[PDB]
Tab-separated table of C-alpha atoms in Angstrom:
chain	number	residue	atom	x	y	z
A	1	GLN	CA	0.883	-4.968	28.606
A	2	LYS	CA	-0.976	-1.764	29.417
A	3	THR	CA	0.241	-0.055	26.232
A	4	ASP	CA	-0.437	-3.173	24.174
A	5	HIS	CA	-4.097	-3.395	25.175
A	6	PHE	CA	-5.262	-0.515	22.975
A	7	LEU	CA	-3.309	-1.922	19.987
A	8	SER	CA	-5.165	-5.208	20.519
A	9	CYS	CA	-8.360	-3.735	19.073
A	10	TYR	CA	-6.764	-3.486	15.599
A	11	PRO	CA	-6.973	-6.333	13.029
A	12	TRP	CA	-3.334	-5.790	11.923
A	13	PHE	CA	-1.830	-6.109	15.399
A	14	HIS	CA	-0.329	-9.552	16.053
A	15	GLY	CA	1.256	-8.969	19.485
A	16	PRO	CA	4.165	-11.268	20.446
A	17	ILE	CA	4.884	-13.108	17.224
A	18	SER	CA	8.513	-13.686	16.323
A	19	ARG	CA	10.456	-11.856	13.640
A	20	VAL	CA	10.617	-15.027	11.544
A	21	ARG	CA	6.900	-15.788	11.774
A	22	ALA	CA	5.960	-12.176	10.970
A	23	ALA	CA	8.297	-12.219	7.956
A	24	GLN	CA	6.723	-15.395	6.611
A	25	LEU	CA	3.227	-14.021	7.181
A	26	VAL	CA	3.918	-10.939	5.057
A	27	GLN	CA	5.977	-12.891	2.473
A	28	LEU	CA	3.368	-15.636	1.917
A	29	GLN	CA	1.806	-14.085	-1.207
A	30	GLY	CA	5.174	-13.181	-2.754
A	31	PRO	CA	5.697	-9.894	-4.613
A	32	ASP	CA	1.928	-9.770	-5.216
A	33	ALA	CA	1.822	-8.696	-1.558
A	34	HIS	CA	4.090	-5.660	-2.012
A	35	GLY	CA	3.160	-3.269	0.768
A	36	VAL	CA	1.305	-5.754	2.975
A	37	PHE	CA	2.141	-5.191	6.633
A	38	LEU	CA	1.519	-6.151	10.213
A	39	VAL	CA	2.443	-4.664	13.575
A	40	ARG	CA	3.950	-6.757	16.367
A	41	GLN	CA	5.860	-6.464	19.609
A	42	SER	CA	9.634	-6.393	19.282
A	43	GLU	CA	11.297	-9.508	20.610
A	44	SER	CA	14.727	-7.862	20.974
A	45	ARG	CA	13.632	-4.557	22.573
A	46	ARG	CA	10.998	-5.318	25.196
A	47	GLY	CA	8.173	-2.794	25.240
A	48	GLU	CA	8.874	-1.576	21.684
A	49	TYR	CA	6.949	-2.481	18.545
A	50	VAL	CA	7.767	-3.368	14.947
A	51	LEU	CA	6.159	-2.690	11.569
A	52	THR	CA	6.922	-5.745	9.422
A	53	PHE	CA	6.094	-5.293	5.757
A	54	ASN	CA	6.566	-6.842	2.320
A	55	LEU	CA	8.827	-4.974	-0.133
A	56	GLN	CA	8.548	-6.757	-3.496
A	57	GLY	CA	8.407	-10.194	-1.830
A	58	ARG	CA	10.984	-9.658	0.934
A	59	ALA	CA	10.174	-8.833	4.556
A	60	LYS	CA	11.459	-5.600	6.121
A	61	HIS	CA	11.251	-4.640	9.809
A	62	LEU	CA	11.000	-1.078	11.141
A	63	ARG	CA	11.159	-0.223	14.835
A	64	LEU	CA	8.221	1.646	16.362
A	65	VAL	CA	8.416	3.383	19.735
A	66	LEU	CA	5.175	4.313	21.453
A	67	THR	CA	5.226	7.158	23.971
A	68	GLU	CA	3.204	7.268	27.191
A	69	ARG	CA	0.253	8.959	25.439
A	70	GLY	CA	0.343	6.562	22.491
A	71	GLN	CA	2.238	8.852	20.131
A	72	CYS	CA	4.328	6.812	17.695
A	73	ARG	CA	7.994	7.547	16.983
A	74	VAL	CA	9.766	6.086	13.935
A	75	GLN	CA	13.335	7.331	14.386
A	76	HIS	CA	13.098	10.985	13.362
A	77	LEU	CA	9.402	10.893	12.410
A	78	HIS	CA	6.616	11.442	14.937
A	79	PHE	CA	2.914	10.630	14.602
A	80	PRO	CA	-0.038	11.182	16.956
A	81	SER	CA	-0.920	7.455	16.834
A	82	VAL	CA	0.124	4.160	15.279
A	83	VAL	CA	-2.915	4.467	12.997
A	84	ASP	CA	-1.797	7.878	11.754
A	85	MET	CA	1.651	6.396	11.055
A	86	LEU	CA	0.068	3.586	8.996
A	87	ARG	CA	-2.205	5.969	7.075
A	88	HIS	CA	0.779	8.208	6.328
A	89	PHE	CA	2.810	5.339	4.868
A	90	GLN	CA	-0.209	4.225	2.837
A	91	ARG	CA	-0.069	7.525	0.939
A	92	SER	CA	3.611	8.481	1.030
A	93	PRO	CA	6.578	6.112	0.619
A	94	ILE	CA	8.604	4.800	3.540
A	95	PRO	CA	11.982	6.673	3.338
A	96	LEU	CA	14.163	3.578	3.783
A	97	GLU	CA	17.949	3.870	3.727
A	98	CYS	CA	18.062	1.700	0.579
A	99	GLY	CA	16.373	4.505	-1.385
A	100	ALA	CA	15.786	3.849	-5.088
A	101	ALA	CA	15.037	0.137	-5.413
A	102	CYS	CA	13.364	0.497	-1.979
A	103	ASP	CA	10.165	2.310	-2.949
A	104	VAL	CA	7.105	1.125	-1.044
A	105	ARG	CA	3.772	2.390	0.272
A	106	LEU	CA	1.760	0.308	2.742
A	107	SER	CA	-1.180	-1.465	1.145
A	108	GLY	CA	-3.170	-4.139	2.971
A	109	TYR	CA	-2.384	-6.067	6.113
A	110	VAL	CA	-2.223	-9.612	7.463
A	111	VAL	CA	-5.263	-10.157	9.667
A	112	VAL	CA	-4.549	-11.649	13.091
A	113	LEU	CA	-6.355	-14.910	13.895
B	1	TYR	CA	15.940	-3.313	11.570
B	2	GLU	CA	15.456	-0.843	8.715
B	3	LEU	CA	16.914	2.653	9.048
B	4	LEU	CA	15.151	5.673	7.551
B	5	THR	CA	17.101	8.416	5.786
């Protein structure tokens, strides 16, 4: 789409891949890939996006809402851009509802073909 | 879909 064209310049953006495929992409290297992520379109909420990431070998999926100006909303958090959101979660942990055993910072990413 | 706290 129009919003998805500027995301298409990033190596970690995979566009319209399914939940299952994205999970397997981030899970491929097992717990060695803790923190590895990608960004895709949501298949269940058209127009919205998803950050799929590896948490100690398992895939997690977090909704991302992009505003008209490209600001990124993650529930209660707000970021000027998707890139700022990624850089934030590379240096502070993702405050997931499963708390303690769910400690993760973003590391690398799965490169789109 | 994960929920933040």
